Amino acid sequence: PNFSGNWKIIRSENFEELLKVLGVNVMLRKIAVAAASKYAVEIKQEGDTFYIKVSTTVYTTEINFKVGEEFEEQTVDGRPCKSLVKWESENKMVCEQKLLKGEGPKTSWTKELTNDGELIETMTADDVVCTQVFVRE
Numbered sequence: 001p002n003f004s005g006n007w008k009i010i011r012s013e014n015f016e017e018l019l020k021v022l023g024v025n026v027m028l029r030k031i032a033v034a035a036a037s038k039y040a041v042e043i044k045q046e047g048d049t050f051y052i053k054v055s056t057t058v059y060t061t062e063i064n065f066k067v068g069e070e071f072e073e074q075t076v077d078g079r080p081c082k083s084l085v086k087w088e089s090e091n092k093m094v095c096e097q098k099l100l101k102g103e104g105p106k107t108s109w110t111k112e113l114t115n116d117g118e119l120i121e122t123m124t125a126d127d128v129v130c131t132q133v134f135v136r137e
């Protein structure tokens with residue numbers, strides 16, 4: 001597999017519903033949904049070490065991890081968490097998250113490379129799955 005690339009979003013589903021679960025009020029939900037239409041992902045993969053840069057028009061953030069080794073990032077709504085990524089198959093990985101402080105919904109994410117050259121990202125909070133699809137730039 002090689003997730004490496006510059007990915008641009010073509011589709012985003014259930015993002016507002018995910019943010020609702022996470023407690024975001026309606027006006028900021030709509031504003032966040034609009035910002036997601038400029039969501040871009042840059043990935044550099046070497047073996048099972050990943051460097052990922054998530055960006056929108058006004059914000060950018062870097063996630064660095066190795067499969068099977070705990071690291072710290074933040075949940076979608078911004079709370080700090082501890083994460084662990086594992087492979088599910090040749091071209092799909094899953095991340096489980098645990099809040100560093102307090103309680104909240106159970107969150108996770110996945111990344112998948114399809115046979116058609118798309119990148120599929122999902123983000124989950126409890127019952128609600130947001131799916132976002134990307135192509136290479």
Ligand SMILES: *C/C=C(C)/C=C/C=C(C)/C=C/C1=C(C)CCCC1(C)C
Nearest residue numbers: 032035036039054056075076109111
């Ligand atoms: C492997 C990919 C990961 C861990 C992606 C993480 C992406 C996010 C936490 C995205 C968050 C967003 C918002 C909270 C509002 C603006 C739109 C997004 C999708 C960039």
